[PDB]
């Protein structure tokens, strides 16, 4: 059961504030990321399920494209759905996973390293990307799909130029063919943590729609 | 880690349409139940965590009291929450569990046997009560507490007769002291399942508040 692709803005210039805001200089200084930038769930360690294949400096913000390739992830989500969730649809295991992910983990969160005094930011700044329900930064929705082309397609304001650099760099990433095997039991726990930690969140589908409208997805 | 009690209306007469409505006649006919009704998580099979100790036909609808006593539930739920989840609060283990359950599974859903054509509703009609996020029926919020009389107290329109009858029958249930073991793994799976199956639900907390008003529990306010 082959890989999944995920993409989206990691931040949108001029939209946040305080601790959250990302600057053009800093973003410019921080690309290309120096090392593999893993992708995990809700910032948990020991919970890597993929990696950023490329990040690009689009006009509106830094934009990324990721691979998530963890066979158990599909097992665990498919096991959880009840028998009538899909009504009379017949879905491939790939399609089901795409839908469940999309709706279970619809946002991303970039974490960065703390800089020491006077220390100019460089390519070591970005640490990883977490999938999560709501990211704190404006417009941090993700799209998941079966190809990198389909994953980026719904981002209407992503420049053509950035999209081209993005896909090209991603096709050359060393991580692109990789697999993350993970214990079913540890995944089930991570994902239950997601639900329990967001169980009290109010108006979640309204905030997701808002994040989509921010990112420029229909 | 002890038992906890759960209670609420399984339906309110005249408050649902079509498929969902339970009439007085159906309830009258279906009580008391032929055998003990298990409590499970969101209708999943192989995940019983308790049992319905008694059901009564209150004026407004059928009302139940149940026990939940699955020892691993507290550990699984507590393992799930982030470490600053409770901020500064000092809570017993039992208080943490009741809070987490109350908010994770705030409703109940009475599941019925599907009848064959020509088959009249009887004492075997009721199959189980599932704990869940929002039940399809109006007014099916539940209350969890450390004792049965406390579990039932917030339902300010439950008749005193029904309330006394409820507690009496529960006091003589054979399930009163049972325990329901599950492996951690099987329980984590079942709880994740509720999350997945309910992830698409819109306005759940507004619908919770509405279910509270419907059932006659003093509605939770947030004015302070
Ligand atoms: Cl890159
Ligand atoms: Cl964030
Ligand atoms: Cl362009
Ligand atoms: Cl919502
Ligand atoms: Cl009974
Ligand atoms: Cl229901
Ligand atoms: Cl809500
Ligand atoms: Mg498609």
């Amino acid at each position: 059961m082959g890989p999944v692709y995920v993409s989206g803005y990691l931040a949108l210039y001029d939209r946040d504030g305080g601790e959250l805001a990302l600057t053009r200089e800093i973003v410019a200084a921080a690309l290309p990321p120096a090392g593999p930038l893993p992708i995990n769930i809700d910032h948990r360690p020991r919970c890597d399920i993929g990696a950023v294949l490329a990040v690009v400096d689009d006009d509106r913000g830094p934009f990324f494209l990721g691979v998530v390739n963890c066979p158990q992830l599909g097992a665990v989500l498919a096991r959880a759905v009840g028998p009538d969730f899909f009504g009379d649809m017949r879905l491939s295991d790939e399609e089901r996973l795409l839908y469940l992910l999309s709706n279970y983990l619809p946002s991303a969160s970039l974490s960065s390293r703390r800089l020491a005094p006077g220390e100019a930011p460089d390519e070591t700044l970005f640490a990883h990307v977490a999938l999560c329900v709501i990211g704190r930064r404006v417009g941090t929705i993700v799209v998941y799909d079966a190809s990198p082309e389909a994953a980026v397609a719904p981002f209407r304001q992503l420049s053509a130029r950035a999209r081209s650099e993005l896909l090209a760099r991603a096709a050359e990433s060393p991580d692109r063919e990789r697999v993350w095997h993970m214990s079913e039991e540890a995944l089930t726990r991570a994902l239950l943590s997601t639900a329990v930690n967001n169980m009290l969140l109010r108006d979640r589908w309204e905030l997701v729609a808002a994040r989509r409208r921010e990112a420029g997805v229909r």
Side-chain angles (χ1 to χ4, degrees), chain A residues 1-113 115-168 170-217:
Chain A
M1 202 199 53
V4 155
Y5 298 86
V6 62
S7 91
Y9 285 100
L10 291 176
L12 281 186
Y13 300 131
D14 293 302
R15 303 291 288 276
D16 303 312
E19 63 188 63
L20 289 180
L22 271 165
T23 264
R24 292 184 209 260
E25 276 65 24
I26 299 286
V27 165
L31 306 179
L37 274 185
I39 294 182
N40 64 45
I41 295 168
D42 279 333
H43 303 277
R44 300 165 66 97
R46 294 176 242 103
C47 203
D48 282 0
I49 51 167
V52 175
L53 299 172
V55 183
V56 293
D57 192 352
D58 175 66
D59 295 286
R60 310 177 52 247
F63 187 93
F64 86 108
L65 176 57
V67 66
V68 166
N69 193 30
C70 174
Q72 298 79 20
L73 178 52
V76 169
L77 289 169
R79 219 163 50 193
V81 279
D84 294 352
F85 185 92
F86 290 115
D88 305 325
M89 309 173 76
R90 184 108 197 74
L91 287 191
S92 71
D93 298 323
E94 190 176 78
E95 299 160 302
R96 183 161 48 239
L97 174 60
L98 286 177
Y99 184 79
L100 295 176
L101 268 176
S102 293
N103 289 287
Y104 199 84
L105 292 170
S107 297
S109 176
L110 175 61
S111 81
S112 311
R113 275 166 203 93
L115 286 137
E119 200 205 315
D122 70 2
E123 294 96 344
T124 64
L125 181 63
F126 299 170
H128 67 244
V129 180
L131 307 177
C132 60
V133 178
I134 298 298
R136 295 164 66 206
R137 299 204 169 89
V138 173
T140 51
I141 208 82
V142 291
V143 181
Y144 299 87
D145 215 316
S147 59
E149 287 82 16
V152 309
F155 297 91
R156 292 168 323 91
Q157 291 143 244
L158 171 64
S159 73
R161 170 219 108 241
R163 186 189 162 270
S164 290
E165 195 200 320
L166 186 80
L167 298 168
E172 273 311 275
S173 164
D175 301 315
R176 73 179 176 279
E177 300 270 72
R178 287 186 51 182
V179 198
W180 293 254
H181 296 289
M182 252 199 85
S183 135
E184 284 182 20
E185 301 191 354
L187 262 177
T188 306
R189 288 194 283 283
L191 292 161
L192 179 63
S193 204
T194 294
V196 174
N197 292 311
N198 292 277
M199 78 180 166
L200 307 158
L201 179 63
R202 260 65 160 174
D203 308 300
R204 67 194 75 202
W205 293 109
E206 179 204 299
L207 311 160
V208 163
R211 285 284 180 262
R212 265 171 201 146
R213 174 151 175 65
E214 283 146 34
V217 179

